Symmetry: D2
Subunit: 259 residues, 4 copies
């Protein structure tokens, strides 16, 4: 039991049923926190995750919601307050992406990604902070960004823009609510072994290509990101606000410049 | 005039009838460019701007369009090509802002600012790049950002996000289209003396407050931003792509840290 | 006992007798590590710190050395290997500063600060990595930077340049030695309650002025920085290399822009 | 010529006889400036450069000096003032580099690179600013950095540190002296086709390798960097201070992330 101060804190996690969201759900369970798992699409996956959280030593519910719908985010935070009594840590983790040459990217496709990856995190952040301010709680927000808030990403201009935006959103909220003890940070994962990438990583030629862009030489394990989230949510990170903490095996250091 | 390579280049400027947009229109007029002035609703200002460009030594048309509307952005670029025969430089300058405590900011208000400031520039950049790619033109995109792609902005989380987003958008498109000789850059204006800012800057105490945030000690003249736009659009900047060039009198250098 | 993996690791800390170096010495003692405290000037202070480390549950020696002298840094690392068997975590924390209008700053004064703050950290980093590479150890380097690797600092151009340099040094070493599992990171403290600042902070007008530049509204406690060092040295930060982790209460977010 | 405000301005350039330094000397010559060419030991190249400036349309002197020596930097700025009457633009361009595994890099080798690349520029900037402050001149400093103030560089940890240091140096001086109208900026060149680089760039495979790191697909011409220097030195950049302007054909945008 690492961060004893996390025990019984209420942690909401959008997209908490798979990948990084699930890894963070589990980790906060290992810290004996009260995890609220948001999911959009697949209850069976969310139920399987709810179980892991409970087994890990935590308490958990699942809540269906589309992060692009204001009522759903408001509902999610309200449900967390109903079920567990309060809110302590808000983790905006939901995200989508798809490759399209930028000059061929449709407005609807651009909007889907912006709506999901950035605006969803804004709504999440807003609702949590609103609750924190009204109830004098020194709460915590973790926004799930990407190396691509810094690394440009051709074929993924919508994704890159969404994370560049998330960066300035996080930094603004951190500055604006710092005097109230509310901290807001980003995590920036590199290439992580999650469902989204499972396709690419099966192709041994593609897996090696991805690996050649990671200086540490391996694709990240999702628990390596959850460890960063645990730290940032904890009182160990008490003087840490408005940062992006990259967990990327060195990827933002320019892989093409390796000796 | 200064940049001879700008002579007869077709330059589209969203929000080109007021403030920075207008100053750029005139400057490109001084370079004998052919300017396409986009405006939202105030035709008189647009027409006013139209003649300034002509009087400075260039050609100019005006075209109504709301950058939150895809058809308007598409129509703007199509009109530019119809009227002047081609497109060389695309300037996404339209922007809106308003102060709201962030936890109180409505979804509609957030969207209006994102849609205008970020999505509008995506749409403009896309339509321009599409034309450049289709016609093998080594064209140029300039996106109007702000010191607030770097400086966070309490009460303006939508504005800050929109420009942070615009930075990665620009950087991505510059990387993606660099092999085609298409350059894409941001300009980052600090506090500028634009018509819109006349309200705040008339008041001596508000003017001093703003000036205290500026290490060079004066509010920028719109022509100083237009000078950056002209440089970036010209072949003088031929090896410059994917950058943000701040014209802010030092504002991004943290004004609270000036010595006593 | 938070980071169980730190127990019995060898941690060298330049300038470990006072301020942040001392706070980190103590913290790694609380993790039951083997702390090597470097000091330049004042044995009595270093002895007082050695005691705190031992009391906190760790083992400790003190080693005199000037970080601007190559032989002293080489000696320090060699002494750590003699006394404790190996090296695991190298923390380059020594630093000096003084205000001078830049156009009046002497070359000797510029050099003292560069030599101390940057070159000392290079020598530290070099000697540790050399040991890591030769002995196949997945070691760790923490370089003590500052908000001023990012915030410019008039009257302190030597200091600012030294930390801007430290940033690219850290990033280069992180990239270069990533394939060997050696991680290299910076910590960037803001205004911290340490000896260097004790003068300024006594003057209630100056203390409030400094506080008005911290969004979180308080001057940092040195243990808040030591918590960051503990994290980064630990296996929790396994996928984290080449970063600067700012612990600054929001200072890098532009204090003049607070609402 | 282009920047009429540069006519008769006194421009000092360290390492001004070869490569980027030379290209800047010539460009400022084209603007009818008065150039002061610093060189380390090769007088013939310096004299060669001297006549190019004159032939391009400017005045020029040459002055020997090692930037690791304080007296040489001091003498350089003093000579410029003696000969031409004043100083307007200071360009710290001298730089050295060599590849060494970092854990094997000697203290002497580290120091040579820090002393030349970083400390030399501090000394040049200091001497220029001192003169500007003493004589109420709204002067200009340009420090020659590199993409490697942002892009880390295995085997060149000394070079990377020196330019990372140079970035905060420039930013600090810009903040500190902005109230006096003195602007201080970095230029960040990518891979450039300078005499020194002729060795690597003759070999087809090494040329292709380097070109593969450049999104625009070509090695920069020294004149493209000189174009940036001219812009930054001129009053066109009047509101631009404390920035790094990368002229790198997109290199800082992460070339490994270009699409297939
Ligand atoms: Cl500030
Ligand atoms: Cl890269």
């Amino acid at each position: 039991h690492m961060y004893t101060d996390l025990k019984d804190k209420v942690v909401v996690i959008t997209g908490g049923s798979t990948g990084l969201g699930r890894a963070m759900a589990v980790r906060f369970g290992q810290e004996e926190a009260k995890v609220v798992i948001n999911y959009y699409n697949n209850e069976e996956e969310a139920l399987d995750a709810k179980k892991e959280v409970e087994e890990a030593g935590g308490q958990a519910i699942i809540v269906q919601g589309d992060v692009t719908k204001e009522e759903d985010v408001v509902n999610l935070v309200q449900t967390a307050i109903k079920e567990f009594g309060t809110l302590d840590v808000m983790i905006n983790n939901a995200g989508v992406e798809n490759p399209v040459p930028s000059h061929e990217l449709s407005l609807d496709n651009w909007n889907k990604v912006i709506d999901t990856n950035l605006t969803g995190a804004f709504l999440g952040s807003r609702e949590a902070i609103k609750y924190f301010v009204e109830n004098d709680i020194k709460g915590n927000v973790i926004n799930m960004s990407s190396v691509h808030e810094m690394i440009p990403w051709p074929l993924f201009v919508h994704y890159a823009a969404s994370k560049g935006g998330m960066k300035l959103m996080t930094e603004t909220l951190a500055l604006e609510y710092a005097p109230k003890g509310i901290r807001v940070n980003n995590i920036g994962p590199g290439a992580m072994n999650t469902p989204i990438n499972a396709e690419k990583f099966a192709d041994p030629v593609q897996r090696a290509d991805v690996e050649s862009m990671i200086p540490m030489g391996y694709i990240g394990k999702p628990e390596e990101v959850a460890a960063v989230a645990a730290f940032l949510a904890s009182s160990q990170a008490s003087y840490v606000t408005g940062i992006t903490l990259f967990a990327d095996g060195g990827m933002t250091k320019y892989p093409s410049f390796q000796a």
